[PDB]
Each structure stands twice: as structure tokens, then as C-alpha cells.
Design an enzyme around this catalytic site. Sequence first.
Site, PDB file in Angstrom:
ATOM      1  N   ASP A 121       0.788  -1.156   0.000  1.00  0.00           N
ATOM      2  CA  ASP A 121       0.000   0.000   0.000  1.00  0.00           C
ATOM      3  C   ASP A 121       0.872   1.280   0.000  1.00  0.00           C
ATOM      4  O   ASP A 121       1.782   1.436   0.792  1.00  0.00           O
ATOM      5  CB  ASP A 121      -0.896  -0.080   1.245  1.00  0.00           C
ATOM      6  CG  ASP A 121      -2.172   0.710   1.127  1.00  0.00           C
ATOM      7  OD1 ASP A 121      -2.188   1.672   0.392  1.00  0.00           O
ATOM      8  OD2 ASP A 121      -3.183   0.333   1.676  1.00  0.00           O
ATOM      9  N   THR A 159      -7.087   3.242  -2.345  1.00  0.00           N
ATOM     10  CA  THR A 159      -6.720   1.841  -2.123  1.00  0.00           C
ATOM     11  C   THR A 159      -7.690   0.811  -2.657  1.00  0.00           C
ATOM     12  O   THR A 159      -7.328  -0.051  -3.419  1.00  0.00           O
ATOM     13  CB  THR A 159      -6.519   1.599  -0.608  1.00  0.00           C
ATOM     14  OG1 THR A 159      -5.571   2.544  -0.167  1.00  0.00           O
ATOM     15  CG2 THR A 159      -6.098   0.202  -0.298  1.00  0.00           C
ATOM     16  N   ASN A 180     -13.203   5.249  -1.912  1.00  0.00           N
ATOM     17  CA  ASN A 180     -13.160   4.555  -0.598  1.00  0.00           C
ATOM     18  C   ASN A 180     -14.445   4.813   0.203  1.00  0.00           C
ATOM     19  O   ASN A 180     -14.684   4.114   1.170  1.00  0.00           O
ATOM     20  CB  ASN A 180     -12.011   5.056   0.189  1.00  0.00           C
ATOM     21  CG  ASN A 180     -10.707   4.399  -0.165  1.00  0.00           C
ATOM     22  OD1 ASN A 180     -10.561   3.241  -0.741  1.00  0.00           O
ATOM     23  ND2 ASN A 180      -9.704   5.085   0.257  1.00  0.00           N
ATOM     24  N   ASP A 261       2.162   2.992   3.183  1.00  0.00           N
ATOM     25  CA  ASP A 261       1.048   3.922   3.188  1.00  0.00           C
ATOM     26  C   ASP A 261       0.733   4.434   4.598  1.00  0.00           C
ATOM     27  O   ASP A 261       0.542   5.654   4.738  1.00  0.00           O
ATOM     28  CB  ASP A 261      -0.229   3.268   2.584  1.00  0.00           C
ATOM     29  CG  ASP A 261      -1.462   4.130   2.638  1.00  0.00           C
ATOM     30  OD1 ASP A 261      -2.179   4.096   3.668  1.00  0.00           O
ATOM     31  OD2 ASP A 261      -1.777   4.805   1.646  1.00  0.00           O
ATOM     32  N   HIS A 265       0.993   8.557   5.242  1.00  0.00           N
ATOM     33  CA  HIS A 265      -0.021   9.483   5.632  1.00  0.00           C
ATOM     34  C   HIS A 265       0.421  10.364   6.792  1.00  0.00           C
ATOM     35  O   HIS A 265       0.135  11.550   6.770  1.00  0.00           O
ATOM     36  CB  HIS A 265      -1.326   8.823   6.027  1.00  0.00           C
ATOM     37  CG  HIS A 265      -2.115   8.337   4.864  1.00  0.00           C
ATOM     38  ND1 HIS A 265      -2.785   9.189   4.027  1.00  0.00           N
ATOM     39  CD2 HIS A 265      -2.335   7.093   4.402  1.00  0.00           C
ATOM     40  CE1 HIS A 265      -3.415   8.484   3.098  1.00  0.00           C
ATOM     41  NE2 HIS A 265      -3.131   7.219   3.307  1.00  0.00           N
ATOM     42  N   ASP A 308      -0.471  -0.288  -5.029  1.00  0.00           N
ATOM     43  CA  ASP A 308      -1.757   0.213  -5.431  1.00  0.00           C
ATOM     44  C   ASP A 308      -1.742   1.665  -5.936  1.00  0.00           C
ATOM     45  O   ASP A 308      -2.516   1.974  -6.814  1.00  0.00           O
ATOM     46  CB  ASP A 308      -2.800   0.043  -4.303  1.00  0.00           C
ATOM     47  CG  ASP A 308      -2.359   0.595  -2.969  1.00  0.00           C
ATOM     48  OD1 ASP A 308      -1.245   1.169  -2.827  1.00  0.00           O
ATOM     49  OD2 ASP A 308      -3.262   0.475  -2.080  1.00  0.00           O
ATOM     50  N   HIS A 309      -0.885   2.520  -5.367  1.00  0.00           N
ATOM     51  CA  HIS A 309      -0.798   3.933  -5.686  1.00  0.00           C
ATOM     52  C   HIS A 309       0.407   4.507  -4.933  1.00  0.00           C
ATOM     53  O   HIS A 309       0.903   3.870  -4.028  1.00  0.00           O
ATOM     54  CB  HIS A 309      -2.064   4.719  -5.249  1.00  0.00           C
ATOM     55  CG  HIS A 309      -2.473   4.473  -3.859  1.00  0.00           C
ATOM     56  ND1 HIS A 309      -1.774   4.964  -2.787  1.00  0.00           N
ATOM     57  CD2 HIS A 309      -3.446   3.689  -3.361  1.00  0.00           C
ATOM     58  CE1 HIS A 309      -2.294   4.498  -1.666  1.00  0.00           C
ATOM     59  NE2 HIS A 309      -3.310   3.707  -1.989  1.00  0.00           N
ATOM     60  N   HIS A 420      -3.257  10.605  -0.989  1.00  0.00           N
ATOM     61  CA  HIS A 420      -3.265  10.140  -2.394  1.00  0.00           C
ATOM     62  C   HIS A 420      -4.706  10.151  -2.808  1.00  0.00           C
ATOM     63  O   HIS A 420      -5.594  10.291  -1.957  1.00  0.00           O
ATOM     64  CB  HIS A 420      -2.646   8.703  -2.478  1.00  0.00           C
ATOM     65  CG  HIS A 420      -3.213   7.749  -1.486  1.00  0.00           C
ATOM     66  ND1 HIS A 420      -4.297   6.950  -1.761  1.00  0.00           N
ATOM     67  CD2 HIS A 420      -2.915   7.537  -0.183  1.00  0.00           C
ATOM     68  CE1 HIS A 420      -4.629   6.274  -0.680  1.00  0.00           C
ATOM     69  NE2 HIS A 420      -3.780   6.593   0.289  1.00  0.00           N
ATOM     70  N   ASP A 674     -20.077  10.068 -27.682  1.00  0.00           N
ATOM     71  CA  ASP A 674     -20.284   9.279 -26.482  1.00  0.00           C
ATOM     72  C   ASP A 674     -21.234  10.042 -25.503  1.00  0.00           C
ATOM     73  O   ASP A 674     -20.861  10.416 -24.351  1.00  0.00           O
ATOM     74  CB  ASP A 674     -18.977   8.992 -25.807  1.00  0.00           C
ATOM     75  CG  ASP A 674     -19.118   7.943 -24.709  1.00  0.00           C
ATOM     76  OD1 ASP A 674     -20.101   7.175 -24.767  1.00  0.00           O
ATOM     77  OD2 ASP A 674     -18.267   7.880 -23.753  1.00  0.00           O
TER      78      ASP A 674
END
Length: 796
Positions: A121, A159, A180, A261, A265, A308-309, A420, A674
Site C-alpha cells: 500500500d 486503495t 473509498n 502507506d 499518511h 496500489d498507488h 493520495h 459518447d
Amino acid sequence: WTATSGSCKGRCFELQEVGPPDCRCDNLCKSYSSCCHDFDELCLKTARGWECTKDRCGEVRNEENACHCSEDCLSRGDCCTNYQVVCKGESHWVDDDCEEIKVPECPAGFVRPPLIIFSVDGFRASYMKKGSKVMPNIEKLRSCGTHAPYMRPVYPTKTFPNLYTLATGLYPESHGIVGNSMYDPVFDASFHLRGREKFNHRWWGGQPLWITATKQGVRAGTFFWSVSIPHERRILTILQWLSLPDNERPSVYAFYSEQPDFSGHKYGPFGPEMTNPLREIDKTVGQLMDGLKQLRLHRCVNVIFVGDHGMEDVTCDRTEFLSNYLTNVDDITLVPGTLGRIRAKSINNSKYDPKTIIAALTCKKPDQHFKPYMKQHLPKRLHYANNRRIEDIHLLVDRRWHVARKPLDVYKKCFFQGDHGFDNKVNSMQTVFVGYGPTFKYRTKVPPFENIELYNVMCDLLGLKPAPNNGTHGSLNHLLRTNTFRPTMPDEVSRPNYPGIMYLQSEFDLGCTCNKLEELNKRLHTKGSTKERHLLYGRPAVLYRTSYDILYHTDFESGYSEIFLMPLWTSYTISKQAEVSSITNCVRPDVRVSPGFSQNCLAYKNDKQMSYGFLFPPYLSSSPEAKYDAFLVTNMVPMYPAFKRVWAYFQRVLVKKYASERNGVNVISGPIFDYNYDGLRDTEDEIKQYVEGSSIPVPTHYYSIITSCLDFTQPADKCDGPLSVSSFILPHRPDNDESCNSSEDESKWVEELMKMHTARVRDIEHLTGLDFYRKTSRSYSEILTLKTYLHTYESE
Ligand SMILES: *[C@@H]1O[C@H](CO)[C@@H](O[C@@H]2O[C@H](CO)[C@@H](O[C@@H]3O[C@H](CO[C@H]4O[C@H](CO)[C@@H](O)[C@H](O[C@H]5O[C@H](CO)[C@@H](O)[C@H](O)[C@@H]5O[C@H]5O[C@H](CO)[C@@H](O)[C@H](O)[C@@H]5O)[C@@H]4O)[C@@H](O)[C@H](O[C@H]4O[C@H](CO)[C@@H](O)[C@H](O)[C@@H]4O[C@H]4O[C@H](CO)[C@@H](O)[C@H](O)[C@@H]4O)[C@@H]3O)[C@H](O)[C@H]2NC(C)=O)[C@H](O)[C@H]1NC(C)=O
Ligand SMILES: Cc1cc(COc2n[nH]c3c2CCN(C(=O)c2ccc4[nH]nnc4c2)CC3)c(C(C)(C)C)cc1Cl
Ligand SMILES: [Ca+2]
Ligand SMILES: [Ca+2]
Ligand SMILES: [Cl-]
Ligand SMILES: [K+]
Ligand code: NA
Ligand SMILES: [Zn+2]
């Protein structure tokens, strides 16, 4: 309800869940409060820690210990991971030289190489370099295996959306985990990080890897790990499962770490406090590798090390407050943070008006650190619109900032220094990919790619047929030593007509206010003599049923739709040496195409909102004879005046700039429809807006695909090797409210707009039903890679 009376004796982390009456001993039991009373005592042992010491070598097995250093531990599959190092004089995996794994070297009974997905993470891409000195195990995987410099996450760069994209191959709009935090108006239900509602299976769409596996007879270990189960126990549990008999042993496993992660933070992505989490994750990697080496599986298993990021510097002070913009702030619900989603607080409020909210949020302060969009107007590369869980009003937040509704939200909830969630092209949001094992290549670097592509590859690694997904299967073949997926190009559905001269000028009523050496030369240009020059990669294939014409010209070739009354695509090559010329309201009938399948100037005169532009740019005409072809009615497309400012700057200034920089370019341009924002070509009956009083449909977007030679010492029209591409999908909007600087000259804002709306060729393919690059000298997998490329405009 829970019934806890039974025992986990001999059942710890059993793979098959049991239903009531039996209490549970699997890894999810804790989350459902359903664990047998003795789960902690038996399944979460910690006695004596996680490492063998010389004094324990050869001990009498004591079943209370967290792990074992007894003679029997290898056959039981419960040695501490460092047992062979400390007790049998072996070396740590990390201290061994890298040696090519040409074929799986597996124990007898293994029907395929297992796959272990080691997910981290918040593991930012630049950690691989910046933390290299403290991560020797990870650095060994990276240098010895196959690695990308970074992997692009999906938007939002949160996440659950990313992890679930890894598992499914799907954009968040399709798998349904769009944030999230979410509200589903159909179910009138709210998904939150905290609480029970997230466990309901209705949230989780698509088909995740463990289900694809199970359905095809391939067993899977857990993917979710309860936060309280320490990392060491997760690793030991994986290793124990790998020691299971052939018919019970999983073939696919996942490990998840909440670090780096968790610390990121609190401390920001490069806070001095970050070094220790990185050391700790590396140690966990070394436990897994040592454990595999003990089991003789370190040259058998394919390991994917993936994030994930990333993580960005964000502080409480860099918060934008909607209460500084909205007088009506108490009438909205905001999903806040590094993105914003707005809806009405009450659906019974008839004064709630999205247009007024959007106007109140648009370019109101000069340094404003978010931008409002209706979701259909977000850059199409984000693929962030087609789900009822995504609110109509979106705020794209600048990197390093937050949005919140009111200040009291950001002091009754500085704490954090990192976060993030931002736009997935932002460098700080990039994450990592390393593949190590017999099926991956040896000491190989691959270009950056998107995480949506990995599901297909993990399916290739396990011999599975992937469920339908958003990857482009074959585009990551270059990561693989074997098990490549070799698709065929899609079959063309509609063959083109090749009309000749069939109509007299007086058959048209457009309302537009208007030598045999150069006569066989103009005939031959209309019959396709320069086509080799302007159509470098074959005609695009039309993958749906329709009626269209190929039209040839000196300077450009087009596929003209008789149904939409304009080209689907227009193709032209601009050399490095080409000249730009000055240019009025002349539009000429095309005598190859009937009046009834043509546009007219009258509709444009009557439609006070709509004007027109041209797909092949009259500015770039090769000769004044060729220039007449640029003003054919069959090169006209509907354009709002606001958008014409953008298009003209692209055509008159940027195309030649690109040809100068890239040593010629080949451009393919066209319309996109579209209206339902699903990222897919509209059918005729989905079109919501026409040019007034006509059947001329109005595009939602205009695309261009700009191709040149990767070796820029070769001109685009004589390129021997790999290609280079950049593309865009520009929103066809009646204002430039997106661009806060648009009152200024186009050189101060158009290029910035184009960069935000950068696109992959594959995005354009979905949106048009066209298949490009059909006739190149390149392998089809190399072309699929090319079609997934995104030019992001972020520095290294
Ligand atoms: C990225 O890859 C994905 C995967 O390939 C692409 O998404 C596919 O796109 C297809 C077209 O949009 C779509 O096909 C439709 O399937 C319908 C049946 O769908 C259900 O069954 C499947 C199979 O297991 C399941 O996967 C679906 O899952 C969706 O819905 C559930 C809950 O509702 C979610 O949990 C799940 O996450 C997923 O949601 C996503 O897709 C839905 C649409 O299905 C969106 O609404 C969500 O926002 C979210 O994006 C479903 O449970 C089928 O009914 C459709 O057929 C209609 O249209 C055809 C015309 O061809 C017609 O013949 C049919 O009869 C039918 O029309 C009738 O219904 C209309 C609407 O009610 C009505 O107006 C008409 O008058 C008719 O009566 C269609 O075949 C497929 O479902 C998705 N799959 C997934 C997983 O998303 C995606 O396109 C790719 N993206 C890009 C950009 O390339
Ligand atoms: C390899 C893989 C693993 C997993 C398992 O992932 C988890 N196992 N255990 C947890 C997770 C997710 C994070 N999590 C959070 O609540 C969380 C963490 C950090 C955050 N940062 N910001 N918000 C945050 C929220 C709960 C702990 C999945 C699935 C889909 C099953 C989740 C798919 C795949 Cl392919
Ligand atoms: Ca995360
Ligand atoms: Ca569509
Ligand atoms: Cl969110
Ligand atoms: K007009
Ligand atoms: Na503007
Ligand atoms: Zn996080």
C-alpha cells in the site's frame, strides 16, 4: 449471530470456510466475529518470535512456539523462515547471486508455477531508487527480474479502487468500487472504510482473480488479510499453504502490507520516518524469499511485487473550502479530500441546481486548487463516469491539496502530511511493478504500463481464461518469457465503398455561397496515388456494421460515414519540411458523395450556436490545387465557436510544431460520439444533439492520433522500426470554462487543455469502433503495447 463452542485445533487458516454450527478458523473469521474461542491461542501464536537462534536448532518441537527450529519443521512446513540459515549453514536468498530462471524448478506434484502477489500500500514509484540502500531484497527482485520504472494506477488513486482493479482488470466505473466512500442511490446504501456495509457482495462487481481461478479449477489462498494479523504470520501462513498436498495447495496467493502507506499518511512520502517502514517491508520480502528457498520453491514461484498507488505531500492548511464559494453550502453533500463528489443533500430540494453549483465553483479565485466538472466532461482517459455511484458533479483537486465543505470538517475530524487520490497521471501517484520468476523475463526493464493490464497477465501466469476486462490482452507479452497470449487482429465488419465521380455540382443545394498534365495527376490523387504517404499504417478497420466511403485526396485520405454525414477518420502526413499557409466560407460539393449523404452550409447558418471546422487542416495544403480538396463538404465537421479556437490552434500551430520536433508526423483525426459517457462508440440512436434543422449529429469529442518514428532521425514516412505516438480526445464544448485563462491568446492555454485530455489509441478505439495500425512492419503484441501508451507530460 455467532456460535463459538468448537475448536481451531488442526484448522488454523483452513482454506475452506465452514458454515454454522461450526465456528471459523479461516483468515476472515475475525472480520465476521465468527472465530472459534481458541483462534488467538492456536492460530496467532507469538511465543519466542519469528527467528530461529543457534540455541533452538534441533529443539524438541514445542507446539506453543510461533514458528519451529526442530528437525521435523521442513516436512511440517512451519519452520521459521531463517531456519536453514541459522541451523543448516545456508545463505539468505538476498546474498545469493542472481541466476537466470529459464524453466520452473518445482517439486514433484506441482502442475504449474504458483503465483504470489506481494502488494504494498502507498508504495510510490520513486521509492525503488530513493530507498534502494535499505531494501536489498526488493532491489534484488527488481534487478534480477522484470521491472517497470513505474506502474500507472487507476483514478481515483485510492486503495480499494486500485486493489480491486488489480484483481479484476476493470476500471472502477465498471467494477463499482469508485472510491473509498460511496453512495449507491439504487440500493440507498453507503459504503465506508469503517463498518459492515462494505462486506456486502453487491458492491464488488466484475470477476476477481480468485473467482476466475476457482471457476477454472485453480485453487486460491486469501487475498484480504485482517489488519491485526502481523506480517510475519501472514508470510508463515502462505508458506504453510505452499506445503499442502497437491489437491489442497493453492496455486495463487496474495500478501498485503499496509506499509508504507500507513506511515506515509502521517509523515509524508519522504519524511525521515519513512526509512524504517521501507526497511521493514524489505525484511518481510526476505522472510518470504528465505521461506521459499527452504521449501525449494524460490525458482518455482512467480512473485509479483506491486503497489496500489503512490503518496503526495498534503497538509491540513492546503484545504479548499466550498463554504468560500457556495452560499448554499448546507444544501450539498460532499465526498471530500483529494477528489470531490457533490450531490444534493436532499432529493426533495427543488432549488438544488447543478449548473448554479458548477458556475459558483468555476475559476472564482486565481490560484484555485480544484476544478469542477460534470462527470461526462472529465478527461476520457480517467474512465470515470459510467456508474450511478459516481455523482454528476466532480472536483478534480490539484496535487498537494484537499477539498472540504467547511472548515469545521478539517478541525473536528495538523495530523496528516501525506495523501493520495489525485489524477492517475500525477507523478507522485505512480506506483511499482516487479515480476520475478520462471515465467517473467530475466534482468529486463519494460516501459511503464497501467495496472488494468495485470489481471490478464496473472491469468496467463496461471493458465486461466480471463473474464472480460479493460486490459488489452497481449500488450504485456513483452514482460513474459513464456505463456504469452497471441491474439488475432479483430475482423473488419464493414467493407468500404470506393466511390468515383457520380454527381453533378447542380444536384447539390448547400447554401454555401460557393491541362492534361495536371488532369491525370488530379485523377490519380483521387484514385489513391499519394495514399502510401498519407495512410502509413493501413486503413483503420471498421468493427461495426455501417455504410462508409474511402475518399482519396492529394494531401489526405478519409473514411466518410454516410450515416453520420462526416468522416470517421481522416489521415494525413505532414513532413518536417511542410509549409503552413494562410486561409473562406467556400464549402464545395464532393461529386463522389450524394447530396443526401452530405452536410450543408444552411444548417450551420441557421444554428446560431454551431459553426464548422475541417478535419484535414486547409493550412497544411500542399499546393493551391490541393487546397480546394480541404474545403469539400465531406471534410467539414460541426464545431462550436469556442472549440474552434482550440482546433485552429492545434491545426495551424501545433501540428507543424510536432512535425518539426518529431521529424514528420502522421495524424489521424475524427469525431467521437459518447452521449451516454460509457467510453464506447454511440449508435445512431444515442445521439442527443444535431445541428439545427438537420440530421448532422454533433460530436461529444474530437480525437487525433499523432504517430512518428521512435528513431526520430528517420522521417515519419520512412520509418524502419518501432513507432512513437501521442493522442488526445478533446471535449467538444460550447465554452472554454474549463480553461480559466482562455480570454488570453491560445498560446497561453490550449496546449495545457490538450495535455489534460491526452489519450491512449485504445481509448479512441473503444470510442469509435475503429482498429488502427493494421498494416505495419511490427509484431502485433508490439502494436498492442503502442495502442496502450499514454503520453502523460509529467517529467521523469
Ligand atoms: C471495460 O470492460 C468491461 C467488461 O467487458 C466493459 O463492461 C461491459 O460492457 C458491456 C456494455 O456496456 C456490458 O454488457 C451489458 O451486459 C448486461 C448484463 O450485465 C449483467 O451481467 C454481467 C455478466 O456477468 C455482469 O458482469 C454485469 O455487471 C454490471 O452490473 C452490476 C450491477 O448492476 C455491477 O455489480 C457490475 O459492476 C457491472 O456494472 C457495470 O456495468 C453496468 C452495465 O452492465 C453499468 O450499469 C454499471 O455502471 C457498471 O459500469 C451485469 O450484472 C446486458 O443486459 C446489456 O444488454 C443491453 O443492451 C443490449 C444492446 O446490445 C441489448 O441487446 C440487451 O437486451 C440490453 O438492452 C436492454 O436493457 C437496456 C438497459 O436496461 C434497455 O434500455 C433496453 O431497451 C433493453 O431492454 C449488455 O450486454 C457488460 O455488462 C459490462 N460488464 C461489466 C462488468 O462492467 C466495459 O465496457 C469496458 N470499458 C471500456 C471503456 O472499454
Ligand atoms: C493483492 C490484493 C489484496 C487485497 C487485500 O487488501 C487488503 N487486505 N487487507 C486490507 C486490505 C486493503 C486496505 N484496507 C484499508 O481499509 C485501507 C488501507 C490503506 C488505505 N489508505 N487509504 N485508505 C486506505 C484503506 C484494509 C486492509 C485485495 C482486495 C480487493 C481483497 C482488497 C486485492 C488484491 Cl489484488
Ligand atoms: Ca492504498
Ligand atoms: Ca457511448
Ligand atoms: Cl473516495
Ligand atoms: K452557426
Ligand atoms: Na475560460
Ligand atoms: Zn492511504
